[PDB]
Amino acid sequence: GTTRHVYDVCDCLDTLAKLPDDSVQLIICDPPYNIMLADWDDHMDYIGWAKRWLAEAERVLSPTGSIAIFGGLQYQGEAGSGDLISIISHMRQNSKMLLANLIIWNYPNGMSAQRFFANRHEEIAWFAKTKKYFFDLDAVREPYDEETKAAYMKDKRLNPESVEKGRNPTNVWRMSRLNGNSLERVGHPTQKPAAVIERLVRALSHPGSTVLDFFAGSGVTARVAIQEGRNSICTDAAPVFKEYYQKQLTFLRSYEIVEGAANFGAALQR
Numbered sequence: 001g002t003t004r005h006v007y008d009v010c011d012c013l014d015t016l017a018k019l020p021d022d023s024v025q026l027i028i029c030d031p032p033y034n035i036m037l038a039d040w041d042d043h044m045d046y047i048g049w050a051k052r053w054l055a056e057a058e059r060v061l062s063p064t065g066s067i068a069i070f071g072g073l074q075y076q077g078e079a080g081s082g083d084l085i086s087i088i089s090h091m092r093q094n095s096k097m098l099l100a101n102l103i104i105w106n107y108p109n110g111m112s113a114q115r116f117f118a119n120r121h122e123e124i125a126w127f128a129k130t131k132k133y134f135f136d137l138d139a140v141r142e143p144y145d146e147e148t149k150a151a152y153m154k155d156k157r158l159n160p161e162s163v164e165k166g167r168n169p170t171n172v173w174r175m176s177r178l179n180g181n182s183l184e185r186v187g188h189p190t191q192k193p194a195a196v197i198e199r200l201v202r203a204l205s206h207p208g209s210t211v212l213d214f215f216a217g218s219g220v221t222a223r224v225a226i227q228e229g230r231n232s233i234c235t236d237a238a239p240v241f242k243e244y245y246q247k248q249l250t251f252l253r254s255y256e257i258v259e260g261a262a263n264f265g266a267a268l269q270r
Ligand SMILES: CSC[C@H]1O[C@@H](n2cnc3c(N)ncnc32)[C@H](O)[C@@H]1O
Pocket: 010, 011, 012, 013, 030, 031, 032, 190, 214, 215, 216, 217, 218, 235, 236, 237, 238
């Protein structure tokens, strides 16, 4: 079972336009939260732009597919920008997708603050295309230690099978962000840690399915896809993305890498 991975440098809408309906199982989405100067030629706000790829994202997702959207809740009101709430409010009015979960990524370290509570969180909005979305909870359960696992086993009030499988990790994930010394770092300023992406890939996609990321950034999605046995399509508008993607590979089982949007199909084949 060899997996295929395609990558390229191009705009997110050009990527989405080349993918057929219901062909992707999971989309990893960590988008820019501000439009470009030139975007003022056709839009008057952030959602005017974002709604285009949000609609395409839903179109390419299969009936059992999902999209995980990273974002914060600190939008300051600047024209042309927004946050995760801007997207959620838009989705509530115009999309039939279901918000399966609003996950809180609670990281340990951060900047200090004297005039407010120091920020230690980022959100992940998990939208499912339909009520029949795929979910592999057991693949992400957190096991109990032998001592606790034995303590619950003796409690006949509890189902032993549930004890054996582990606990639901909940919708609050306490995971560290990458540090300036991390081995995963490739140079991208907002690089996401593999651990967070791994949990999303394991729980929201099945082995051999396609994971898509059109704001690929560091290319961490491809590295995780490969390690987890999924196929992937990763694109980014920045030329430097190719360099990052190649670096992710060095960090790395049968898989094939293919460059070029003309080859997206290689990663869509089941
Ligand atoms: C994961 S950080 C967000 C990423 O989105 C990329 N990006 C910004 N605007 C676009 C766009 N219109 N199409 C594709 N990628 C984009 C940026 O280059 C960055 O690496």
